[PDB]
Amino acid sequence: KPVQNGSQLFIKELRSRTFPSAEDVVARVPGSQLTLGYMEEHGFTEPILVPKKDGLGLAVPAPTFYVSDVENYVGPERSVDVTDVTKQKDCKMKLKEFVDYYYSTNRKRVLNVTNLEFSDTRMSSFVEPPDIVKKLSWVENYWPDDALLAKPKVTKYCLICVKDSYTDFHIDSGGASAWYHVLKGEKTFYLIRPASANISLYERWRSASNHSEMFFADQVDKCYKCIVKQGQTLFIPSGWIYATLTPVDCLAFAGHFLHSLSVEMQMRAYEVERRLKLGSLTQFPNFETACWYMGKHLLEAFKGSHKSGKQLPPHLVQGAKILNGAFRSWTKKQALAEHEDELPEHFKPSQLIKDLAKEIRLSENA
């Protein structure tokens, strides 16, 4: 018989198993040193652990903020997605019901809430993402407040995981980058670098019928174990393939974002998820729309570079090229009525593409 991912026996085996330490891969960095400059220097290709929130500009409630408090500020009647970890199946229920389960003592099932986005609730004012996320975020920087399409609702997630909760290996939707702040308890991350072959293996694993019977880390050379403890914040870069195990009841906050340092990985991950045709919780809404606004921004940056003579950094020019490729792909004749639904008002794709292509040429000559 095969071991089912997320099962009690799986958890036991997983806890006993040895992994390479995240020591080699995850930088420990004080909040204040996590600047745009830092990110640009290192390129945000590896996860970053910030042991204390000081300097991050992260706003979160005190650790005396409990799940019962979440219930009050989010609202007991709110519908929430709940994962039954042992079955690896998902269902819906009112938050009050989950909270009832959470506080029970005879706790049979293993259930978690991992996609409660609360920007539309009273609890929203209690949490502000780290300053660096805001500085990097395409949505925060380039999506206009008067936009007719709604901003991707992925900025503030509340996660509630019971002891022995497990979330299986995945890449975040849109190849989005993520921050995770553990308010109470702890969460163990198992991190796999998105080397090209690893991504391919991941795609083939996600698409197999027996994938819930296969431990993906078995297929790769290095899967790093990183324990994130109370008060600590982990930043996960674009495309990283990761799973998590919860050793004790945990309450955490998280957010997802796109940025200019991983344009290529973002597109690669998006193409993988579009081939998989799976989706789920935390699907990145209006990913293409964010891309369109980025594209408009780039044209403006280019045009403004003539006035100042200062060229765009090569990663931005390379980013422009990749985005233009996508735009062409999304607007070709055979290309969906799915794609037009994500185009912002007043956009002229044929012209943007033509205009971007010209500006990329003008910059390359130099």
Swiss-Prot record:
Name of the protein in its database record: Lysine-specific demethylase PHF2
Q: How is it modified after translation?
A: Phosphorylated by PKA on specific serine residues, leading to the formation of an active lysine demethylase complex.
- Which residue spans adopt a coiled-coil conformation according to this UniProt entry? none
**Any domain commentary?**
The PHD-type zinc finger mediates the binding to H3K4me2 and H3K4me3.
Question: Which function does this protein serve?
Answer: Lysine demethylase that demethylates both histones and non-histone proteins. Enzymatically inactive by itself, and becomes active following phosphorylation by PKA: forms a complex with ARID5B and mediates demethylation of methylated ARID5B. Demethylation of ARID5B leads to target the PHF2-ARID5B complex to target promoters, where PHF2 mediates demethylation of dimethylated 'Lys-9' of histone H3 (H3K9me2), followed by transcription activation of target genes. The PHF2-ARID5B complex acts as a coactivator of HNF4A in liver.
The residues that the entry says bind 2-oxoglutarate are: 114, 167, 180, 187, 242, 244
Name where it's found.
Nucleus, Nucleolus; Chromosome, Centromere, Kinetochore
Per the database record, which ranges form the JmjC domain?
Answer: 118-274
> What is the similarity comment for this entry?
Belongs to the JHDM1 histone demethylase family. JHDM1D subfamily.
Q: Which residues of the whole protein are included?
A: 80 to 445 of 1096
Q: Where does Fe cation bind?
A: 170, 172, 242
**Tissue spec:** Widely expressed, including in liver (at protein level).
Subunit-structure text: Component of the PHF2-ARID5B complex, at least composed of PHF2 and ARID5B. Interacts with HNF4A and NR1H4. Interacts with RELA.
Q: Which organism is it from?
A: Homo sapiens
